[PDB]
């Protein structure tokens, strides 16, 4: 049988190929004399139809189409971290270094993980010839970075008896470091494994998610919390903060590694990430270190070929499932899952399939479902136990800014967290522009068991904050047709504290150093003060409206105007300059100052 | 090296339907190759192979299919994709939407034959656009600052002076080598003459190129027009290392040409019947912006678009708003009140501004001052909406100050003469001359250090 067929026809990203008898669906192929990557999207006889992952301009009828028997797949191993890859796992750094050009050349065959570099490999010591080994067993640790111990492990499909294990030393991605035998057949493994991206990497069990994914942002961590292992969407119109949030989780979160998928995003996004992440630093063991050492980028910017958007999502989740099997609490950003759905729309359109809504294919719901269900906290495969996770954050970008959109509607039925960004807040430069009416998190019952331990004061405060904000909306619908003079003094206090919560709690400037990050101890301390004012001010009115000595919102404002200014000033406290004890002491002083001022009105 | 093999010419037009001419018996059709059609009367036309299948090649004809004949038409297949004969000598010149000259000069002698599609600039080699441009306009240089190499469109209602603003950016733009490439899609001659005349009158010609597709020129050229402009800008900005500013006029008429092609090809519709892939196609135009590794040059872009029916949610401004970094908005709610330039800051935003401001670029207060101007202007619109129901008797003294802020802001901060140039520093001085209307404690977006250094000055 011929190892290659031939191009029969072309229509944008879709190529029909003849002499493809015996090609598997989703088999990867090389199309054209430039060997463009593509994947078989349909079969139609001795003929196949290929979703080409690179731009088909100049492909000709009768061009060779090489088959491979491989599905679309990712090399996994040392040298992922800190690198930036295209949507089909080719490193953009080596593409630049080899080509010596600002452009990505069509059909470049650069190896995904470099083979000239030697890596420091420590075998797991317990393993020896004759020992038993199974998929996901960590047989050595590669010292990839100061932050990331790269746990090398047996590929999930592999199992057998150890026949050789390499001693401690330096090795490359083609050096054999482990050899197995199973049923009398030998199998040689280097530090690199290849995984089919469309197939989920297996696990021993998918555990319940029960620890917060603390982020950069007050409103997220406090009012709509994500969980390590949780599925999250950020549906938002243009210019709302969907990437600022995606970046802020990536810059500032308790995640061990980040996979950042620039799927269909603007070009300068990847440049901003590569500008900031080598300069920005976390701290470990008293050592300052660059956060780029814990991040991988899967770029596929809006102009790069439409088909590569799908491969980019499946690449970033396959990388995320790989570090999940190492026990790392992975976080995966997807910068627009609707720019992915638009690629499914386009290939489906070129194939002339029947659409469901706005031209999207009927399988869009299942494609999104079998992406978000790759999240979780897991008992990993293999011998040493691990509790790794993938947390997924899909920055849905609804056409026209309208959440009735099919990608948003399908995504909302799949995620457990929804940070809906309102363009009206973003226009006002109220950032983060998360709308607290529409947003939700389904993880609160699972996280209450964490807050009751680490932050026992918090669950009442979270509840009161949501209630004060809900009351402000239910009051505003009245005020807008009659004027503020209609309200009771308790309701003036409710509106004013909802303005404090809006302008100083929920709002957070992600660039200025005071609000560039906001740890949970700062967040609870700020909220505790704003709600302490509410409960005392409300009590002050309710205690005295029964009498001629009645307190009012104006009486409180005139006696306590400096307290209102101090409450708003709490955001300016800076965890770089100010120690935890200093911020806690200042916030305790505002609690005491408020108590003594309200005691002076009563 | 050069393609030495002689071109085949086909009479085998097996069908014609809408803008498509379906050749047959073709030898190894090359997808997206360019064909030169000769009609029965000898009229030359050009077209791109949009689909191929065996012996068939579906040529879309740029000049349209009227007069194509299934027996006498001759199709010369050039064997290669559409290329622009680029050179330095395209500065000081005017070309139609297909790249032929219309200044009565000769054809361009090519220094290179760049593919009109360009290539994706590798995201590792894309330098982040940190340096500021002063446009000279306070509504921009203050609250919407533009970086060197930052793509940022003017969005406008129909009939607004957006062309005069874009001309003012060409007139006044400079840093806090330079060149312009102007493109226009479906521009009326009354406006094409305005841009050509403004560049000639300002003496700019020796550093500007114009691509003009007029309102009566064949609509399919609109698809290649901004690509010819960007292909020329990539030559000038990457091969010659100029700072190029690219102006793309009525991307709305570009998007209408996409809607026409999809309606004729029966491609899948997104919103309002535009192609389902419209974001990718706009990205192939808009992402050809920005600085790159080891090149001194840069491609800035200012696209321009008439928003249909003023609808910010329309697919043209929406998909443009999801690609381009920030949008400058111009509004009838300013223009009817004679406020020129009619730039409504509130819906506006420059994504690359956060980097293009502060020490070495601009005064240290700029990042804070901008955000407080947005707060005061926005609260001004909100208390204005309240006043229209409940009257000024229900507004507090502070709400009246936000209304006085709105009046002083539109009169002083936005309003500016067509030849008046304002520095960013003068704009921030005017910013404080407005922010000083409120008591210091009201300025809830600004740090206490910035207030202590700048509020009393």
């Amino acid at each position: 049988e011929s190892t290659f067929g031939y191009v029969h026809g072309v229509s944008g990203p879709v190529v029909t190929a003849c002499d493809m008898a015996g090609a598997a669906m989703y088999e990867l192929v090389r199309v054209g004399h430039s060997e463009l990557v593509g994947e078989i999207i349909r079969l139609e006889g001795d003929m196949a139809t290929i979703q080409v992952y690179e731009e088909t301009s100049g492909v000709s009828v009768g061009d060779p189409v090489l088959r491979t028997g491989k599905p679309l797949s990712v090399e996994l191993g040392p040298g992922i971290m800190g690198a930036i890859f295209d949507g089909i796992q080719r490193p953009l750094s080596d593409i630049s270094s080899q080509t010596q050009s600002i452009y990505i050349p069509r059909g470049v065959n650069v190896s995904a993980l470099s083979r000239d570099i030697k890596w420091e490999f420590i075998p797991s010591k317990n393993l020896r010839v004759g020992s038993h080994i199974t998929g996901g067993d960590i047989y050595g640790i590669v010292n990839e970075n100061s932050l990331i111990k790269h746990k090398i492990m047996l590929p999930p499909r592999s199992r057998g008896s150890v026949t050789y294990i390499a001693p401690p030393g330096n090795y490359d991605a083609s050096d054999v470091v482990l050899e197995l035998e199973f049923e009398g057949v030998k199998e040689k493994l280097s530090m690199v494994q290849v995984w089919p991206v469309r197939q989920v990497r297996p696990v021993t069990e998918k555990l319940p998610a029960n620890h917060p994914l603390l982020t950069g942002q007050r409103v997220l961590d406090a009012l709509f919390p994500c969980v390590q292992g949780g599925t999250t969407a950020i549906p938002g119109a243009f210019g709302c903060g969907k990437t600022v949030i995606s970046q802020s989780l990536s810059k500032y979160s308790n995640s061990d590694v980040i996979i950042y998928v620039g799927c269909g995003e603007r070009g300068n996004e990847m440049s901003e990430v590569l500008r900031d992440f080598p300069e920005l630093t976390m701290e470990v063991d008293g050592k300052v270190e660059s956060i780029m050492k814990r991040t991988a980028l899967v770029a596929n910017t809006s102009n790069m070929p439409v088909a590569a958007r799908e491969a980019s999502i499946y690449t970033g989740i396959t990388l995320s499932e790989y570090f999940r099997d190492m026990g790392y609490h992975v976080s995966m950003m997807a910068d627009s899952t609707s720019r992915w759905a638009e690629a499914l729309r386009e290939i489906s359109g070129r194939l002339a399939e029947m659409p469901a809504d706005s031209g999207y294919p009927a399988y869009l719901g299942a494609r999104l479902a079998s992406f978000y269900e790759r999240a979780g906290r897991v008992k990993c495969l293999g011998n040493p136990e691990r509790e790794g996770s993938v947390s997924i954050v899909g920055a849905v970008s609804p056409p026209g800014g309208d959440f009735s959109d099919p990608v948003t509607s399908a995504t909302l039925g799949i995620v457990q967290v929804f940070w809906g960004l309102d363009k009206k807040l973003a226009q006002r430069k109220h950032f983060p522009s998360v709308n607290w009416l529409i947003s939700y998190s389904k993880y609160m019952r699972a996280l209450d068991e964490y807050y009751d331990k680490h932050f026992t004061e918090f669950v009442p405060l979270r509840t009161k904050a949501k209630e004060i904000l809900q009351e402000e909306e239910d009051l505003a619908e009245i005020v807008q047709l009659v004027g503020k003079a209609s309200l009771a003094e308790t309701d003036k206090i409710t509106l004013e504290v909802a303005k404090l919560i809006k302008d100083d709690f929920l709002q957070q400037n992600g660039y200025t150093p005071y609000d560039r990050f906001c740890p949970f101890y700062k967040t609870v301390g700020m909220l505790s003060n704003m709600i302490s004012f509410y409960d005392m001010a409300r009590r002050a009115v309710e205690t005295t409206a029964q009498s001629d000595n009645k307190i009012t919102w104006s009486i409180i404002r005139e006696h306590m105007g400096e307290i209102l200014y101090k409450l708003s000033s709490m955001k300016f406290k800076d965890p770089v300059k100010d120690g935890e004890a200093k911020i806690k002491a200042d916030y305790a002083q505002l609690l005491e100052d408020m108590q003594n001022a309200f005691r002076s009105l009563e | 090296n050069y393609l030495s093999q002689p071109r085949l010419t086909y009479k085998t037009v097996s069908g014609v339907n809408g803008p498509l001419v379906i050749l047959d018996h073709v030898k190894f059709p090359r997808y997206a190759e360019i064909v030169h059609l000769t009609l029965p009367d000898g009229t030359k036309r050009s077209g791109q192979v949009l689909e191929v299948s065996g012996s068939k090649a579906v040529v879309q004809v740029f000049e349209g299919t009227s007069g194509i004949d299934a027996k006498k038409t001759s199709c010369e297949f050039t064997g290669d994709i559409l290329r622009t004969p680029v050179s330095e000598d395209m500065l000081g010149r005017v070309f139609n939407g297909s790249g032929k000259p219309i200044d009565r000069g000769p054809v361009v002698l090519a220094e290179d034959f760049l593919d009109i599609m360009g290539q994706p600039i590798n995201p590792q080699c894309r330098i982040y656009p940190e340096e500021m441009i002063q446009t000279g306009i306070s509504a921009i240089d203050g609250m919407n600052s533009i970086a060197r190499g930052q793509k940022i469109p003017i969005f406008s209602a129909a009939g607004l002076p957006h062309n005069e603003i874009a001309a003012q950016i060409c007139r006044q733009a400079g840093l806090v080598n330079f060149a312009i490439v102007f493109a226009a899609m479906g521009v009326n001659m009354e406006t094409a003459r305005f841009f050509k005349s403004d560049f000639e009158e300002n003496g700019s010609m020796d550093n500007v190129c114009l691509f003009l597709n007029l309102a009566n020129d064949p609509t399919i050229e609109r698809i290649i027009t901004p690509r010819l402009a960007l292909t020329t800008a990539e030559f000038l900005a990457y091969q010659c290392e100029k700072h190029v500013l690219v102006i793309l006029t009525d991307m709305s008429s570009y998007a209408e040409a996409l809607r026409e092609v999809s309606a004729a090809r029966e491609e899948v519709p997104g919103r309002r019947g535009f192609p389902g892939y419209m974001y990718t196609d706009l990205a192939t135009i808009y992402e050809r912006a920005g600085r790159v590794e080891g090149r001194n040059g840069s491609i800035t872009q200012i696209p321009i678009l008439t928003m249909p029916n003023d609808d910010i949610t329309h697919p043209i401004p929406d998909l443009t708003g999801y690609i381009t970094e920030g949008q400058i908005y111009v509004d009838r709610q300013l223009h009817n009140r004679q406020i020129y330039p009619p730039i409504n800051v509130l819906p506006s935003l420059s994504r690359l501004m956060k980097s293009a401001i502060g020490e070495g670029m601009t005064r240290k207060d700029h990042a804070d001052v901008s955000n407080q101007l947005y707060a005061c202007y926005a609260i001004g619109k909100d208390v204005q909406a309240m006043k229209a129901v409940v009257g000024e008797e229900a507004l507090t003294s502070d709400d009246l100050l936000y209304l006085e802020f709105l009046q002083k802001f539109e009169k002083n901060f936005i309003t500016q003469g067509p030849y008046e140039n304002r520095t960013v520093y003068e704009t921030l001085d005017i910013g404080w001359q407005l922010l000083r209307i409120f008591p210091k404690e009201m300025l809830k977006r600004i740090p206490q250090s910035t207030l202590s250094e700048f509020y009393p000055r």
């Binding site: 029947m354 659409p355 | 029966e266 899948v268 519709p269």
Partner: peptide
């Protein structure tokens, strides 16, 4: 409209295939 237009096109293609199969 788009769905129904594609259905009518697919029916035209089925008719053309049937006319070829009758050869």
């Amino acid at each position: 409209f788009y769905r129904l237009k594609k259905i009518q096109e697919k029916k035209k293609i089925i008719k053309e295939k049937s006319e070829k199969d009758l050869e």
